[PDB]
RNA sequence: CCGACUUACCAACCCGAUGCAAACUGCGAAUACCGGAGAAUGUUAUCACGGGAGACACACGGCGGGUGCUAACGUCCGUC
RNA sequence: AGCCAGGAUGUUGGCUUAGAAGCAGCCAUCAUUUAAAGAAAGCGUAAUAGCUCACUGGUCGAGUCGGCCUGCGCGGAAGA
RNA sequence: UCCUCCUAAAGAGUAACGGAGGAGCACGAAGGUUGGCUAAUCCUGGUCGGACAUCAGGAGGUUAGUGCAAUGGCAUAAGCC
RNA sequence: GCUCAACGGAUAAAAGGUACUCCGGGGAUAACAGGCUGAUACCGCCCAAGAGUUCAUAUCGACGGCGGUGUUUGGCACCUCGAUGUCGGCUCAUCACAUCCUGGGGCUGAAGUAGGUCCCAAGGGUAUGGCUGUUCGCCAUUUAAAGUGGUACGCGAGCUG
């Protein structure tokens, strides 16, 4: 999990999702790019 | 070093002001005499009544009213009194 | 003179000299002619050579991709690829100097199922990073 | 062929014009011809989406005031520095 | 770098920023970065755009710098005192008002345009939108 | 014997479109200042002369700036 | 939305390249049967292969999608 | 110590080891007065002579000039004889 | 008749040392510490040309941009000159977390072993010597580890000198 300030999608099975008050971007294709915003 | 020596400077240099501009405005009353405008150079000419020096101070030449006005092909500014 | 190496691939041809008629002496010509070399190899800017070498790998099929990016990755550009029918038979230049190791690496790539031939190709011009370390 | 309801200012100045723009309208201006310019004020939105057009500069236009009709051609805008908005409008009569 | 090739003098007052700006208009190209905030660009930074901004484009279409460094910017050395006169001049700046264009393109597709602005707006301190050519 | 052309080179002056300036001005305020007149208000609040002084280390805040990093409960001026 | 089905013939377009087979990179980006289909948006292959998407037909049967402006919030946000 | 400009906020004045420059003279004519005269630069043509010397014409209009810095001024010239 | 130019001109006429010092004063004015600030420093983040065989973001990251801390070198001179003892060591500590070890976890260019990089976590623990007054530093040998910083660069009415 990359934590940054700038979450996006980087390609197109990324999926920004909420979860406890934190932008989350979850990839269903490959695990580099999830991302949490922090 | 603990601390570094500084330079100088090369421009502490500067003239006295000369007092220079208007003394009496439009519609003083003045005596003759009496200096209106100090200047460097002509910016004001001498009209009626009023005489130029040699460092271009315009005086009073009578006794009256104090009157800025443009006269001329070129617009300069000449000063005139109206004798009252 | 640039990093005390075999100088190749010279050509020189005189057509210019002079001489003192009781002073010439084969001894002065001599050392002359070294004179010349300095001033001649300085502005030509050379270039070193390292020993580019043909490489013949043998390898399974399923591991084809494996073996090409460490070719790759040696600084070797391939020339032929042969479809044998017991896995492929790939050839590259991959420089000696950056080929060392090379065996066991390959090995692991390949399930300790692969081999190559070496045989000196030729001598080409080292890339910058590479000719400095040596020039250092 | 654009129909622009626009209202004569009953108030202008720097003041009058600042409150205008917060009240979403702006003010124009209409001259030309012989007769005295005419100072109105007109809706902001209503001639943002009609003045995207590149036709809206050219063609003539259509102005109401008090159910009068006046033939004009948008002459100038001023538009603001940064947003998206018009300042004022300069439009000439025939 | 941009900078004056001679001045009238080499050193300014610090001055203040005020007011709105002139040039708000896309007057040469079809495409321009308009500046939204108020501050100073330093040339360094007008050129690290510059050159993102003209590679994004792939050295399509043409580029035209609408800004230029003309405001000396003095510096103390490090561990001086207060007086002495005044610094020595390390860097030029701009002075941006909200609205100047700063950067204007022609040439090349609406939504290549776009893309270049954002890369090249993230090189700059003050806020920017982007803004096309109007008809006035 | 004075010549007449030409090309994808450099190209000054000039023209059109753009900006910038404390030591740029073909423009130009608001205020401030000087003077004349009028009312109202103000315990003469004004000036002159004379007796007595103290004081000449200022501080912060607003506004206009120089310097510093539009850093400082920094420093230096104007004004309240 | 989703689900079912297709997503095809020049063709592996040419150039380049050890290979470039829609998908390293260049130029072109055209024809065909079509209900539709890109000289291909992406994953994948050493190159193939393979997997989705664009697009289309059916199924469902009522609203849905994307920008612009703007108010208040969210993360960025660690000290004895 | 003195002069010029900016800071200096359109009267005067206004500080800093703020930003830039000068003066410690010269001239019996370079002063007084009368009369007379008007530049820089560029183009065209012309012996040496050319980018640039003197000459003719044109454009232009003070972009020159002022014994010496800077500012203000100067054609009725304060500039030149 | 005065570069009386230190130009309102002390006299016609005048340079230095003091750690052997002395007096009157000032925190009006410096050195230590505190304070304000944060250029610099350190830490974090934003955009991604490129390195990484291919692949920007496993790991790095040019040109540039925005913050945090008070933490280095500084800037200021607000407190103390009718005194706030100034480096290092010893003894004794205590806090913060931007975690050195141990604990939990995500990604990896993570086969395993061993790592890399982020996220959470401050309960405990976290060397001995050689050389130099040294803090550091280099070196020798250990250790699971030999953390970073604040506490008047903690601690002399506790010691050393
Ligand atoms: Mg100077
Ligand atoms: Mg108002
Ligand atoms: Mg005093
Ligand atoms: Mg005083
Ligand atoms: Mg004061
Ligand atoms: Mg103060
Ligand atoms: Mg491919
Ligand atoms: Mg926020
Ligand atoms: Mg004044
Ligand atoms: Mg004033
Ligand atoms: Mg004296
Ligand atoms: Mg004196
Ligand atoms: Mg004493
Ligand atoms: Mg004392
Ligand atoms: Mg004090
Ligand atoms: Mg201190
Ligand atoms: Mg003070
Ligand atoms: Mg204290
Ligand atoms: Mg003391
Ligand atoms: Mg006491
Ligand atoms: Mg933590
Ligand atoms: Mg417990
Ligand atoms: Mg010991
Ligand atoms: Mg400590
Ligand atoms: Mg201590
Ligand atoms: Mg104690
Ligand atoms: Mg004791
Ligand atoms: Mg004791
Ligand atoms: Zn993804």
Same mark, same amino acid.
């Given at each position: 999990?990359? #934590?940054?300030?700038?979450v996006?999608?980087?390609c197109?099975?990324?999926?920004?999702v909420?979860? $406890?008050?934190?932008?989350?971007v979850?990839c269903?294709?490959? =695990?580099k790019?999830? /991302?949490?915003?922090? | 070093?603990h601390?570094?020596?500084?330079?100088?400077?090369?421009?502490?240099r500067?003239?006295?002001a000369?007092?220079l501009?208007?003394?009496?405005?439009?519609?003083e009353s #003045?005596?003759?005499?009496?200096? +209106?405008?100090r200047?460097?150079?002509?910016k004001?000419?001498?009209?009626?009544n009023?005489?130029?020096?040699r460092?271009?101070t315009?005086?009073?030449?009578?006794?009256?009213?104090?009157?800025?006005?443009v006269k001329?092909?070129?617009?300069?500014?000449?000063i005139?009194?109206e004798?009252? | 003179?640039?990093?005390?190496?075999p100088?190749?691939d010279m050509? +020189?041809?005189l057509?210019?000299?002079s001489?003192?008629?009781?002073?010439?002496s084969?001894?002065?010509?001599?050392?002359?002619?070294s004179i010349?070399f300095?001033?001649?190899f300085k502005?030509?800017?050379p270039?070193?050579?390292?020993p580019?070498?043909?490489?013949?790998?043998?390898?399974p099929?399923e591991?084809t991709?494996?073996?090409?990016? $460490?070719?790759?990755?040696?600084?070797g550009?391939l020339?032929?690829?042969?479809?044998?029918?017991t896995?492929?038979?790939?050839?590259?230049?991959? =420089?000696?100097?950056?080929?060392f190791?090379?065996?066991? /690496?390959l090995?692991?790539?390949?399930?300790?199922r692969?081999?190559?031939?070496m045989?000196?190709?030729?001598?080409?011009?080292? =890339?910058?990073?590479?000719?400095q370390a040596?020039?250092? | 062929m654009?129909?622009?309801?626009?209202?004569?200012?009953?108030?202008?100045?720097?003041?009058?014009?600042?409150?205008?723009?917060?009240?979403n309208?702006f003010?124009? *201006?209409?001259?030309?011809?012989?007769?005295? =310019?005419l100072?109105?004020?007109? $809706?902001?939105?209503?001639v943002?989406?009609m003045?995207?057009?590149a036709?809206?500069?050219s063609?003539?236009?259509? *102005?109401?005031?008090?159910?009068k009709?006046?033939?004009?051609?948008?002459?100038?805008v001023?538009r603001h520095?940064?947003?998206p908005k018009?300042?004022?409008?300069?439009?000439?009569?025939? | 770098?941009?900078?004056?090739?001679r001045?009238?003098?080499?050193?300014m007052?610090?001055?203040?920023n005020?007011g709105?700006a /002139?040039?708000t208009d896309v007057?040469?190209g079809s495409?321009?970065?308009?500046?939204?905030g108020?501050?100073?660009?330093?040339a360094?930074?007008?050129?690290?755009?510059?050159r993102?901004?003209?590679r994004?484009?792939?050295?399509?279409?043409?580029i035209? +710098?609408?800004?230029?460094? $003309?405001?000396?910017i003095?510096?103390?050395?490090?561990?001086?005192?207060?007086?002495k006169?005044?610094?020595?001049?390390?860097?030029?700046?701009?002075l941006? /008002?909200?609205?100047?264009?700063?950067?204007?393109?022609?040439?090349?597709?609406?939504?290549?345009?776009?893309?270049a602005?954002?890369?090249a707006?993230?090189?700059?301190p +003050?806020?920017?939108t982007?803004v096309?050519?109007?008809?006035?």
């Open positions: 999990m990359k #934590v940054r300030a700038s996006k999608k980087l197109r099975n990324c999926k920004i909420k979860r $406890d008050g934190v932008i989350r979850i269903s294709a490959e =695990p790019h999830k /991302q949490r915003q922090g | 070093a601390k570094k020596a500084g330079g100088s400077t090369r421009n502490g500067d003239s006295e000369k007092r501009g208007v003394k009496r405005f439009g519609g #003045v005596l003759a005499g009496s200096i +209106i405008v200047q460097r150079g002509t004001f000419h001498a009209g009626a009023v005489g130029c020096g460092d271009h315009l005086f009073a030449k009578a006794d009256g009213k104090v009157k800025f006005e001329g092909p070129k617009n300069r500014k000449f005139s009194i004798a009252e | 003179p640039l990093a005390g190496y100088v190749v050509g +020189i041809r057509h210019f000299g001489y003192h008629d009781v002073d010439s084969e001894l002065a010509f001599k050392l002359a002619a010349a300095k001033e001649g502005k030509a800017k270039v070193l050579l390292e580019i070498m043909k490489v013949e790998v043998e390898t099929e591991n991709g494996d073996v090409i990016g $460490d070719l790759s990755r040696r600084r550009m020339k032929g690829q042969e479809s044998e029918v896995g492929v038979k790939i050839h590259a230049e991959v =420089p000696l100097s950056e080929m190791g090379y065996a066991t /690496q090995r692991s790539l390949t399930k300790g692969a081999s190559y031939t045989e000196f190709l030729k001598y080409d011009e080292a =890339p910058s990073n590479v000719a040596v020039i250092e | 654009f129909t622009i309801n626009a209202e004569v200012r009953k108030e202008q100045g720097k003041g009058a014009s600042r409150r205008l723009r917060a009240a309208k003010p124009a *201006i209409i001259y030309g011809g012989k007769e005295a =310019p100072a109105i004020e007109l $809706d902001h939105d209503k943002m989406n003045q995207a057009k036709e809206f500069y063609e003539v236009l259509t *102005i109401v005031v008090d159910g009709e006046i033939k004009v051609k948008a002459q100038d001023q520095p940064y947003k018009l300042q004022h409008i300069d439009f000439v009569r025939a | 770098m941009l900078q004056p090739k001045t009238k003098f080499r050193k007052h610090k001055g203040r005020r709105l /002139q040039g007057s040469f495409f321009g970065l308009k500046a939204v108020r501050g100073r660009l330093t360094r930074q007008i050129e690290a755009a510059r993102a901004m003209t994004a484009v792939k050295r399509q279409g043409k035209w +710098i609408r800004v230029f460094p $003309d405001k000396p003095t510096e103390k050395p490090l561990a001086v005192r207060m007086g006169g005044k610094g020595n001049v390390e860097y030029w700046v701009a941006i /008002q909200p609205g100047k264009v700063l950067y204007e393109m022609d040439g090349v597709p609406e939504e290549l345009a776009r893309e602005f954002k890369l707006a993230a090189k700059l +003050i806020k920017t982007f096309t050519k109007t008809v006035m």
